[PDB]
Amino acid sequence: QKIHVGPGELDDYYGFWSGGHQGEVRVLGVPSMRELMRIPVFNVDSATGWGLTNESRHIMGDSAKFLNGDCHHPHISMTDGKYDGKYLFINDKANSRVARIRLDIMKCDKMITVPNVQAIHGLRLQKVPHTKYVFANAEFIIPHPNDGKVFDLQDENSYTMYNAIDAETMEMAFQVIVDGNLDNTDADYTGRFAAATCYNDWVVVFDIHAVEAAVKAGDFITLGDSKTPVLDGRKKDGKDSKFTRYVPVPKNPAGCNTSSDGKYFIAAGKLSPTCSMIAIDKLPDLFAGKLADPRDVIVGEPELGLGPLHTTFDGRGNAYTTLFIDSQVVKWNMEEAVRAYKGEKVNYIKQKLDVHYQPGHLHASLCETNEADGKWLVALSKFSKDRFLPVGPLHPENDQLIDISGDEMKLVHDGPTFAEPHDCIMARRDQIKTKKIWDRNDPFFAPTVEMAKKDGINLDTDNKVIRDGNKVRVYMTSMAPAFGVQEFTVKQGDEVTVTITNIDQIEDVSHGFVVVNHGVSMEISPQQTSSITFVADKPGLHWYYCSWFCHALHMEMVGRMMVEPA
Amino acid sequence: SKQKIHVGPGELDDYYGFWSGGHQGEVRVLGVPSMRELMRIPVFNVDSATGWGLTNESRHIMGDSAKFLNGDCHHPHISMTDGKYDGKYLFINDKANSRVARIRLDIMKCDKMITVPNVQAIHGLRLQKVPHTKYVFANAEFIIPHPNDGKVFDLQDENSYTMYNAIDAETMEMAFQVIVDGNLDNTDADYTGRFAAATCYNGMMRNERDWVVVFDIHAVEAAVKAGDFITLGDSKTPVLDGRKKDGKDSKFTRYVPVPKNPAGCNTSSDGKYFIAAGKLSPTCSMIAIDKLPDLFAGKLADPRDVIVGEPELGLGPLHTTFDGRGNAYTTLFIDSQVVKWNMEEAVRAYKGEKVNYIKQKLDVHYQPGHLHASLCETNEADGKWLVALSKFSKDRFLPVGPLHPENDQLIDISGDEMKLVHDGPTFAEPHDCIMARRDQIKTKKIWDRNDPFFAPTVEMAKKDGINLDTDNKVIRDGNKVRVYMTSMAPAFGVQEFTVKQGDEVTVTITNIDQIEDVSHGFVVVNHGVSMEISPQQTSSITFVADKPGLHWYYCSWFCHALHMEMVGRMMVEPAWSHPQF
Ligand code: CUA
Ligand code: CUA
Ligand code: NA
Ligand code: NA
Ligand SMILES: [Zn+2]
Ligand SMILES: [Zn+2]
């Protein structure tokens, strides 16, 4: 199979990598494993101005004050259990956020700080009938309220919550209080159930239908100043709530992965050298009180090796699980494991492949959908040791591409990556459709169009300087190789906003705008409007220039800001 | 020798590649020929992963410029001794905020940074080669008034100009600046230490308004030593005037006419030529370095007499590199090619001989700017690999929305025929890169406890009576709290501490693991705090505890099977329970 993409040939899949502790999302081509694009999210990007521009800071809201993020779990929206190419979602463990990326423009377009929680870690999407909810785990137990009166993590009001975000509006849908700490999560192939591993064990299963019914009936509380409906999924005096069931699983379980045939939530055993297989079609009976014991929903518990952490699927009936301690990927047959659990003498283990070294997550192509195609697998290992040239005290993660198309897994490529991406997701080339040039009506800069409208500005044509007290709003078009406004004058101390509309119509003619020695930088792609605000705190003449190479005469796309002394 | 071209699992790259991070502001370490990124080195960007731009150590190195979250990089170069890479430092420019940064290649971190005074936009940058990299040479691109205090905006005033800049590579303080006529583009240095050269351009309009300005560094140093210099503003940097005055040359410069708006300025690896790319002229011009002493001594009738070749190459020549076999390779931005040509044959053609100095034109994809052959900047130029960095990748990669990657194409030049081998997409237009042999780079896996990178922090701790290798203590000082802890996977040495709302909290962590690749992190949830601490490093970070209640901190970098348990809690007592101001 493939492996090599030579010059002039194109990759067959898109890969979306978490940016790890660096806070961005990265677009790779598969199988070449080359990085095609970086999408800034929680990081501040000098190149495009994300975190500096008004459009980006508007999307980030108050959290624009933070310059960091910590990403782990990238997932793509689905319709009828298949990737639909609309959105990517990702967590921020550092500042408790979820971000949405629009796959048509490859930019973060919405971001939410999850209220009344600390640290968004595990994250996955509803599959069916479509991605109505983003499900996100908050990892750390905190007091409620967290106002400094109570610090006791055993207090009855100290807990964490499972979080549901409306994928389309990017507002909170509901939160469910749980017992324990939440690790990973996944959803079924109907919309009724979701599940999460939780430590301090179990897999907690949520009846999303029951949660929704309670929200619609108004049977919920709110916490603090958030309107989010809050439901109590904890056990009370050994009694279950309508919303949750706690299924005992060993032991401090890690990954929680839904098989592509929709049959199983598979929890990785971590301390237990096993995975536990929860039969999704027994969950209705569990919630209806027809089973004697929550353990009755467990239909398999295969013994796999030391340190199972995560599981993925080839769509052919096999599961692939990382063994962190043994440092391998183990391929095993799920139905054979189920028969073994009944006492049948059958060997469900197909192969163990050594990986290098200490794998955490792994991801097979289309594995989160009923179209799982069994072509490529990436295992993301933490300790790369001698697999790459030494580069000082830090080391790259080793993301190893493995051909799973035949009976034998074959290691084909070691891909070093920065800041521990942790997990990734692949999509067929034909599942992703991107815009070549911006729509003038795009919501990404719609607030800036509205601001311009208030100033009487037609952004497609105008080159004007608006004076408003000590505020100056410069509006210009740009067309390589000239800025539409090549000089302007302000007073020292003025707050200057520069709004640039790139009116080039040629694909890939990106412009930039940098004000020398003012910390101002941003990108403006064809038909985009971008804006940036800074204080002209230095008298004298100050050059601005187009940063992105756009033309043979790129070096002459410059201008001058003249700042009259106070 | 037949060189490896693909690197399979378990095999290692043969060269390090140091890529400019372009408008993104970092430096990137690649493996060559795989073209895979092995590491990112934060420089002018703020890095969430390691905390560069957030930590006290990094902000101390950045100085006042730590207030900027952006940079614009182009020109990465490695220090040299006797015209060979010595693997000590890499330097790079910042065009956006007028800086030069130094990276220590043993720790792979930026260890020094300088804002060049009295200029705007540091663009071209290259290093002295011989006898070693004493100076970093850096062009400021834009003409500005002096002083630039808002009284005079006229760019044709007698005090409006830009300057060529020399920074002491070892001290990272300014050495001198030379005023020039026109705007400066690119620069390179000879193989003796006496000469450097830069491309620059700009009756009322003469035909001759494009040149390569040559600097007599020896003459510059003599004027500094004699005290024949001025200073500008509050900078003590010696400023020499290298402008032409009513046709008379200064002692410091000569202007060699070279068409037209010339771009690249590249010293051949045999030390014979400065080669300027003609850009708007479809040529390169070859300046004979061995004729420069005569030029400065007045033994030549015309500065053009130092030109010994001017090959016609194609449309839009921008940059030139060298295989060490006598061939030059030049990018053609408009024709979209790399052209291989023989330098000594171009020289013969300049004397009138009909000889075809052009050997091959290779199509590249598309619009190449800079290009770089392995070891090309040294007398060890080995003729193995060439990277051409092209601006418009068009359909060479899958579409990814309106913004596109640069196409950095790896080309095998080991034989007579250039062969295109790999298309490498890169983010934010790196522009240029530099390669070094694996054996020219020696990195540390474990920090030394006396490393200057965090020596200021060590000194601070000593004022508190702290032994950083052992102590787990919370020092209170008014409304400042200084937490000091060791860390050893999988535990922080301080797992809980209490402060008052509003306290300024500094957390200093010393990773006392002595095993390679056991990096720790430190993130305070919902406070915008994140940093790396590698084995034997001390790292520190300061933030305000502005929110009452219990606030978790955790180890971000995977360090241990029990990584998920490497957590702690900051308790913040509410302001209403303490004295009020
Ligand atoms: Cu616009 Cu370069
Ligand atoms: Cu220390 Cu993970
Ligand atoms: Na929002
Ligand atoms: Na400095
Ligand atoms: Zn994870
Ligand atoms: Zn350049």
Side-chain angles (χ1 to χ4, degrees), chain A residues 498-545:
Chain A
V498 180
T499 299
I500 299 171
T501 297
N502 179 345
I503 64 173
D504 270 311
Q505 279 279 355
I506 311 154
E507 292 188 21
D508 287 335
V509 177
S510 287
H511 307 162
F513 174 77
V514 172
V515 186
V516 172
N517 299 350
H518 289 64
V520 169
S521 183
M522 72 182 181
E523 189 266 337
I524 325 92
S525 284
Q527 303 299 302
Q528 183 182 13
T529 295
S530 304
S531 67
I532 190 153
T533 301
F534 59 96
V535 176
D537 67 344
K538 291 176 277 295
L541 184 149
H542 301 281
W543 286 91
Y544 54 92
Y545 68 92

Short mmCIF file of all heavy atoms in Angstrom, two decimals, chain A residues 498-545:
data_model
loop_
_atom_site.label_atom_id
_atom_site.label_comp_id
_atom_site.label_asym_id
_atom_site.label_seq_id
_atom_site.Cartn_x
_atom_site.Cartn_y
_atom_site.Cartn_z
N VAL A 498 -6.49 49.34 12.08
CA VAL A 498 -6.28 49.21 10.64
C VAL A 498 -7.09 48.02 10.16
O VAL A 498 -6.90 46.90 10.63
CB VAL A 498 -4.80 49.06 10.27
CG1 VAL A 498 -4.66 48.93 8.75
CG2 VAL A 498 -4.01 50.25 10.78
N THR A 499 -8.00 48.27 9.22
CA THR A 499 -8.85 47.25 8.62
C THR A 499 -8.48 47.15 7.15
O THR A 499 -8.53 48.15 6.42
CB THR A 499 -10.31 47.64 8.78
OG1 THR A 499 -10.63 47.74 10.18
CG2 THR A 499 -11.24 46.61 8.09
N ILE A 500 -8.08 45.95 6.71
CA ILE A 500 -7.60 45.73 5.35
C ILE A 500 -8.49 44.70 4.68
O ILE A 500 -8.75 43.63 5.26
CB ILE A 500 -6.13 45.27 5.34
CG1 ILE A 500 -5.24 46.34 5.96
CG2 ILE A 500 -5.67 44.98 3.91
CD1 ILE A 500 -3.82 45.90 6.19
N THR A 501 -8.96 45.01 3.48
CA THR A 501 -9.74 44.08 2.67
C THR A 501 -8.92 43.71 1.45
O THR A 501 -8.60 44.57 0.62
CB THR A 501 -11.10 44.67 2.30
OG1 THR A 501 -11.86 44.91 3.50
CG2 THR A 501 -11.88 43.71 1.40
N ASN A 502 -8.53 42.43 1.35
CA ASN A 502 -7.75 41.94 0.22
C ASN A 502 -8.69 41.73 -0.97
O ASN A 502 -9.50 40.79 -0.97
CB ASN A 502 -7.06 40.62 0.61
CG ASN A 502 -6.24 40.02 -0.52
OD1 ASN A 502 -6.39 40.41 -1.68
ND2 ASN A 502 -5.36 39.07 -0.19
N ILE A 503 -8.61 42.61 -1.97
CA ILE A 503 -9.53 42.54 -3.10
C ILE A 503 -8.92 41.82 -4.30
O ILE A 503 -9.47 41.86 -5.40
CB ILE A 503 -10.12 43.91 -3.49
CG1 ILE A 503 -9.01 44.86 -3.96
CG2 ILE A 503 -10.92 44.50 -2.32
CD1 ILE A 503 -9.52 46.20 -4.54
N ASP A 504 -7.78 41.16 -4.11
CA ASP A 504 -7.30 40.25 -5.14
C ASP A 504 -8.30 39.10 -5.30
O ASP A 504 -8.95 38.68 -4.34
CB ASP A 504 -5.92 39.69 -4.76
CG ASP A 504 -4.77 40.56 -5.27
OD1 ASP A 504 -4.78 40.92 -6.46
OD2 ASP A 504 -3.85 40.88 -4.48
N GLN A 505 -8.43 38.61 -6.53
CA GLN A 505 -9.31 37.49 -6.83
C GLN A 505 -8.55 36.22 -7.19
O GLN A 505 -9.18 35.19 -7.47
CB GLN A 505 -10.28 37.86 -7.96
CG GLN A 505 -11.49 38.67 -7.52
CD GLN A 505 -12.59 37.80 -6.91
OE1 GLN A 505 -12.50 36.57 -6.90
NE2 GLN A 505 -13.65 38.45 -6.42
N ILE A 506 -7.23 36.26 -7.18
CA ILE A 506 -6.39 35.13 -7.56
C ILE A 506 -6.21 34.25 -6.33
O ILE A 506 -5.89 34.75 -5.25
CB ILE A 506 -5.03 35.63 -8.05
CG1 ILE A 506 -5.20 36.75 -9.09
CG2 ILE A 506 -4.20 34.48 -8.60
CD1 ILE A 506 -4.02 37.69 -9.15
N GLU A 507 -6.39 32.94 -6.50
CA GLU A 507 -6.09 32.02 -5.42
C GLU A 507 -4.66 32.21 -4.94
O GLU A 507 -3.74 32.50 -5.71
CB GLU A 507 -6.24 30.58 -5.90
CG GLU A 507 -7.66 30.15 -6.21
CD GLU A 507 -7.75 28.66 -6.48
OE1 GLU A 507 -6.85 27.92 -6.04
OE2 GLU A 507 -8.73 28.24 -7.13
N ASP A 508 -4.47 32.04 -3.63
CA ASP A 508 -3.16 31.96 -2.99
C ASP A 508 -2.36 33.27 -3.05
O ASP A 508 -1.16 33.27 -2.80
CB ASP A 508 -2.35 30.74 -3.46
CG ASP A 508 -2.87 29.40 -2.89
OD1 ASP A 508 -3.52 29.40 -1.81
OD2 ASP A 508 -2.64 28.34 -3.51
N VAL A 509 -3.03 34.39 -3.31
CA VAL A 509 -2.37 35.71 -3.20
C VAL A 509 -2.74 36.25 -1.83
O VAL A 509 -3.65 37.07 -1.67
CB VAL A 509 -2.75 36.63 -4.36
CG1 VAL A 509 -2.12 38.02 -4.21
CG2 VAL A 509 -2.35 36.00 -5.71
N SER A 510 -1.99 35.81 -0.82
CA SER A 510 -2.18 36.30 0.55
C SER A 510 -1.34 37.55 0.76
O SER A 510 -0.24 37.66 0.21
CB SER A 510 -1.80 35.23 1.56
OG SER A 510 -2.80 34.23 1.58
N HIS A 511 -1.89 38.51 1.50
CA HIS A 511 -1.17 39.70 1.92
C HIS A 511 -0.94 39.62 3.42
O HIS A 511 -1.60 38.86 4.14
CB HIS A 511 -1.99 40.97 1.64
CG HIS A 511 -2.46 41.08 0.23
ND1 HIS A 511 -3.49 41.92 -0.14
CD2 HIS A 511 -2.05 40.47 -0.91
CE1 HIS A 511 -3.69 41.82 -1.44
NE2 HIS A 511 -2.83 40.95 -1.93
N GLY A 512 0.00 40.43 3.88
CA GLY A 512 0.22 40.62 5.29
C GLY A 512 0.24 42.09 5.63
O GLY A 512 0.20 42.97 4.76
N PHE A 513 0.31 42.36 6.93
CA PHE A 513 0.40 43.72 7.43
C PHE A 513 1.15 43.66 8.74
O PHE A 513 0.69 43.00 9.68
CB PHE A 513 -0.99 44.32 7.65
CG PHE A 513 -0.97 45.68 8.29
CD1 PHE A 513 -0.64 46.81 7.55
CD2 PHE A 513 -1.32 45.83 9.62
CE1 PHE A 513 -0.63 48.07 8.13
CE2 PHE A 513 -1.33 47.10 10.22
CZ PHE A 513 -0.97 48.21 9.48
N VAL A 514 2.30 44.33 8.80
CA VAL A 514 3.15 44.42 9.98
C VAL A 514 3.49 45.88 10.19
O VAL A 514 3.93 46.54 9.25
CB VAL A 514 4.45 43.61 9.82
CG1 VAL A 514 5.40 43.88 11.01
CG2 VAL A 514 4.14 42.12 9.64
N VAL A 515 3.31 46.38 11.42
CA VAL A 515 3.78 47.71 11.79
C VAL A 515 5.08 47.53 12.56
O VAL A 515 5.11 46.89 13.62
CB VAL A 515 2.75 48.49 12.61
CG1 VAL A 515 3.25 49.93 12.85
CG2 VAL A 515 1.40 48.50 11.89
N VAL A 516 6.17 48.08 12.02
CA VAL A 516 7.49 47.80 12.57
C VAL A 516 7.56 48.33 13.99
O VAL A 516 7.16 49.47 14.28
CB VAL A 516 8.59 48.41 11.68
CG1 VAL A 516 9.96 48.29 12.37
CG2 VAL A 516 8.61 47.74 10.30
N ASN A 517 8.06 47.49 14.90
CA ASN A 517 8.34 47.86 16.29
C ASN A 517 7.10 48.20 17.10
O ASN A 517 7.21 48.85 18.15
CB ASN A 517 9.40 48.98 16.38
CG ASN A 517 10.73 48.55 15.79
OD1 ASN A 517 10.93 47.37 15.49
ND2 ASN A 517 11.64 49.51 15.61
N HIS A 518 5.91 47.77 16.66
CA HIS A 518 4.68 47.93 17.44
C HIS A 518 4.03 46.61 17.81
O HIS A 518 2.95 46.62 18.41
CB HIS A 518 3.66 48.80 16.69
CG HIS A 518 4.02 50.26 16.62
ND1 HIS A 518 5.13 50.72 15.95
CD2 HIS A 518 3.41 51.35 17.14
CE1 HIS A 518 5.20 52.03 16.06
NE2 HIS A 518 4.16 52.44 16.77
N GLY A 519 4.64 45.47 17.47
CA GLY A 519 4.03 44.18 17.79
C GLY A 519 2.75 43.89 17.05
O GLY A 519 1.86 43.23 17.60
N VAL A 520 2.63 44.35 15.80
CA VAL A 520 1.40 44.24 15.01
C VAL A 520 1.70 43.37 13.80
O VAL A 520 2.62 43.67 13.04
CB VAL A 520 0.92 45.64 14.56
CG1 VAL A 520 -0.18 45.51 13.53
CG2 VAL A 520 0.47 46.47 15.77
N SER A 521 0.91 42.30 13.62
CA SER A 521 1.11 41.40 12.49
C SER A 521 -0.21 40.69 12.19
O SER A 521 -0.91 40.26 13.11
CB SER A 521 2.17 40.35 12.85
OG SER A 521 2.42 39.49 11.76
N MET A 522 -0.54 40.55 10.91
CA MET A 522 -1.72 39.78 10.56
C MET A 522 -1.68 39.43 9.08
O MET A 522 -0.94 40.01 8.30
CB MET A 522 -3.02 40.53 10.89
CG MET A 522 -3.31 41.71 9.95
SD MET A 522 -4.80 42.61 10.41
CE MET A 522 -4.89 43.87 9.13
N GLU A 523 -2.52 38.46 8.71
CA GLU A 523 -2.62 38.00 7.34
C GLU A 523 -4.00 38.35 6.81
O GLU A 523 -4.98 38.41 7.57
CB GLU A 523 -2.38 36.49 7.29
CG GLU A 523 -2.25 35.91 5.90
CD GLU A 523 -3.58 35.39 5.39
OE1 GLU A 523 -4.45 35.09 6.23
OE2 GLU A 523 -3.75 35.28 4.15
N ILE A 524 -4.08 38.61 5.51
CA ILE A 524 -5.36 38.87 4.84
C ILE A 524 -5.35 38.09 3.52
O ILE A 524 -4.63 38.46 2.58
CB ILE A 524 -5.63 40.36 4.58
CG1 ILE A 524 -5.07 41.24 5.70
CG2 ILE A 524 -7.12 40.60 4.39
CD1 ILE A 524 -3.63 41.73 5.43
N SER A 525 -6.14 37.03 3.45
CA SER A 525 -6.23 36.20 2.26
C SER A 525 -7.23 36.78 1.27
O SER A 525 -7.96 37.73 1.59
CB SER A 525 -6.62 34.78 2.66
OG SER A 525 -5.49 34.12 3.21
N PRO A 526 -7.29 36.24 0.05
CA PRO A 526 -8.16 36.82 -0.99
C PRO A 526 -9.61 36.92 -0.55
O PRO A 526 -10.21 35.94 -0.10
CB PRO A 526 -8.00 35.84 -2.17
CG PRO A 526 -6.61 35.28 -1.97
CD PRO A 526 -6.47 35.13 -0.47
N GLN A 527 -10.17 38.12 -0.68
CA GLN A 527 -11.54 38.47 -0.30
C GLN A 527 -11.79 38.49 1.21
O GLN A 527 -12.95 38.63 1.63
CB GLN A 527 -12.58 37.63 -1.04
CG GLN A 527 -12.47 37.73 -2.57
CD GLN A 527 -12.68 39.14 -3.06
OE1 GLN A 527 -13.72 39.74 -2.81
NE2 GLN A 527 -11.68 39.69 -3.75
N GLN A 528 -10.76 38.36 2.04
CA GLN A 528 -10.93 38.46 3.48
C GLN A 528 -10.82 39.93 3.91
O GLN A 528 -10.13 40.73 3.28
CB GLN A 528 -9.85 37.64 4.19
CG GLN A 528 -9.94 37.60 5.72
CD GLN A 528 -8.79 36.81 6.34
OE1 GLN A 528 -7.80 36.49 5.68
NE2 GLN A 528 -8.93 36.50 7.62
N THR A 529 -11.51 40.27 5.00
CA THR A 529 -11.26 41.51 5.73
C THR A 529 -10.70 41.16 7.10
O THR A 529 -11.28 40.34 7.82
CB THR A 529 -12.56 42.29 5.92
OG1 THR A 529 -13.07 42.73 4.64
CG2 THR A 529 -12.33 43.50 6.82
N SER A 530 -9.58 41.79 7.48
CA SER A 530 -8.95 41.58 8.78
C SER A 530 -8.65 42.93 9.40
O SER A 530 -8.36 43.90 8.70
CB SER A 530 -7.62 40.81 8.64
OG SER A 530 -7.77 39.57 7.97
N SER A 531 -8.69 42.99 10.73
CA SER A 531 -8.43 44.26 11.41
C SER A 531 -7.61 44.04 12.67
O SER A 531 -7.63 42.97 13.28
CB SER A 531 -9.72 45.03 11.74
OG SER A 531 -10.47 44.34 12.72
N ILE A 532 -6.90 45.09 13.07
CA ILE A 532 -6.00 45.02 14.22
C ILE A 532 -5.92 46.39 14.86
O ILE A 532 -5.93 47.41 14.17
CB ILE A 532 -4.62 44.44 13.83
CG1 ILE A 532 -3.76 44.12 15.07
CG2 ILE A 532 -3.88 45.36 12.84
CD1 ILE A 532 -2.72 43.01 14.84
N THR A 533 -5.87 46.42 16.19
CA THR A 533 -5.89 47.67 16.95
C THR A 533 -4.64 47.76 17.82
O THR A 533 -4.28 46.80 18.51
CB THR A 533 -7.17 47.76 17.79
OG1 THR A 533 -8.31 47.69 16.92
CG2 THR A 533 -7.20 49.07 18.60
N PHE A 534 -3.97 48.91 17.76
CA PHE A 534 -2.76 49.15 18.54
C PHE A 534 -2.67 50.63 18.89
O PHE A 534 -3.32 51.46 18.27
CB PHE A 534 -1.51 48.74 17.75
CG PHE A 534 -1.35 49.50 16.45
CD1 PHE A 534 -0.55 50.63 16.38
CD2 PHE A 534 -2.00 49.07 15.30
CE1 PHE A 534 -0.41 51.32 15.17
CE2 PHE A 534 -1.87 49.77 14.10
CZ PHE A 534 -1.06 50.88 14.04
N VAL A 535 -1.82 50.95 19.86
CA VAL A 535 -1.63 52.33 20.29
C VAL A 535 -0.37 52.88 19.63
O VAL A 535 0.68 52.23 19.63
CB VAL A 535 -1.54 52.43 21.83
CG1 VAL A 535 -1.23 53.86 22.26
CG2 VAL A 535 -2.84 51.98 22.45
N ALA A 536 -0.49 54.08 19.04
CA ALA A 536 0.64 54.75 18.40
C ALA A 536 1.38 55.51 19.49
O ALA A 536 1.28 56.73 19.63
CB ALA A 536 0.16 55.67 17.29
N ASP A 537 2.14 54.77 20.29
CA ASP A 537 2.77 55.35 21.47
C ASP A 537 4.15 55.94 21.19
O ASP A 537 4.80 56.42 22.12
CB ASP A 537 2.83 54.34 22.62
CG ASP A 537 3.75 53.16 22.34
OD1 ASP A 537 4.13 52.92 21.18
OD2 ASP A 537 4.09 52.44 23.30
N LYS A 538 4.60 55.92 19.94
CA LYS A 538 5.94 56.38 19.61
C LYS A 538 5.86 57.46 18.54
O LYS A 538 5.39 57.19 17.42
CB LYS A 538 6.81 55.22 19.11
CG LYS A 538 7.14 54.20 20.20
CD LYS A 538 7.93 53.01 19.63
CE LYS A 538 7.00 51.97 19.01
NZ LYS A 538 6.12 51.35 20.03
N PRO A 539 6.28 58.69 18.83
CA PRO A 539 6.27 59.73 17.79
C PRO A 539 7.19 59.35 16.65
O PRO A 539 8.07 58.49 16.78
CB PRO A 539 6.81 60.97 18.51
CG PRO A 539 6.71 60.67 19.97
CD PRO A 539 6.87 59.18 20.09
N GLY A 540 6.99 60.01 15.52
CA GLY A 540 7.87 59.89 14.38
C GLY A 540 7.26 59.05 13.27
O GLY A 540 6.05 58.77 13.25
N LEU A 541 8.11 58.66 12.34
CA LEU A 541 7.70 57.91 11.15
C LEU A 541 7.90 56.42 11.42
O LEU A 541 8.97 56.00 11.88
CB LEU A 541 8.53 58.35 9.94
CG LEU A 541 8.17 57.72 8.59
CD1 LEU A 541 8.45 58.70 7.47
CD2 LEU A 541 8.93 56.43 8.39
N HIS A 542 6.87 55.62 11.14
CA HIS A 542 6.91 54.19 11.42
C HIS A 542 6.42 53.41 10.21
O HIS A 542 5.28 53.60 9.77
CB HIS A 542 6.11 53.85 12.68
CG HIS A 542 6.62 54.56 13.90
ND1 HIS A 542 7.74 54.14 14.59
CD2 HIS A 542 6.21 55.70 14.51
CE1 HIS A 542 7.97 54.97 15.59
NE2 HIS A 542 7.06 55.92 15.56
N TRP A 543 7.27 52.55 9.68
CA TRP A 543 6.97 51.80 8.47
C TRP A 543 6.02 50.65 8.76
O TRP A 543 6.09 50.02 9.83
CB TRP A 543 8.26 51.25 7.87
CG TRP A 543 9.08 52.31 7.22
CD1 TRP A 543 10.05 53.07 7.80
CD2 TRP A 543 8.99 52.73 5.86
NE1 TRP A 543 10.58 53.95 6.87
CE2 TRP A 543 9.94 53.75 5.67
CE3 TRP A 543 8.19 52.35 4.78
CZ2 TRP A 543 10.11 54.40 4.45
CZ3 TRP A 543 8.36 52.98 3.57
CH2 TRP A 543 9.32 53.99 3.41
N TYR A 544 5.13 50.38 7.81
CA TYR A 544 4.40 49.13 7.77
C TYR A 544 4.65 48.45 6.44
O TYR A 544 4.91 49.11 5.42
CB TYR A 544 2.90 49.29 8.07
CG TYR A 544 2.11 50.29 7.24
CD1 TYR A 544 1.44 49.90 6.07
CD2 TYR A 544 1.96 51.60 7.67
CE1 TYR A 544 0.67 50.81 5.33
CE2 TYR A 544 1.21 52.52 6.94
CZ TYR A 544 0.56 52.13 5.79
OH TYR A 544 -0.19 53.06 5.11
N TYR A 545 4.59 47.12 6.44
CA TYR A 545 4.92 46.37 5.24
C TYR A 545 4.07 45.12 5.14
O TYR A 545 3.51 44.63 6.14
CB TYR A 545 6.42 46.02 5.17
CG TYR A 545 6.88 45.02 6.22
CD1 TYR A 545 6.89 43.66 5.95
CD2 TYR A 545 7.31 45.45 7.48
CE1 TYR A 545 7.32 42.73 6.90
CE2 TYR A 545 7.74 44.53 8.45
CZ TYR A 545 7.73 43.17 8.15
OH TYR A 545 8.16 42.25 9.08
#
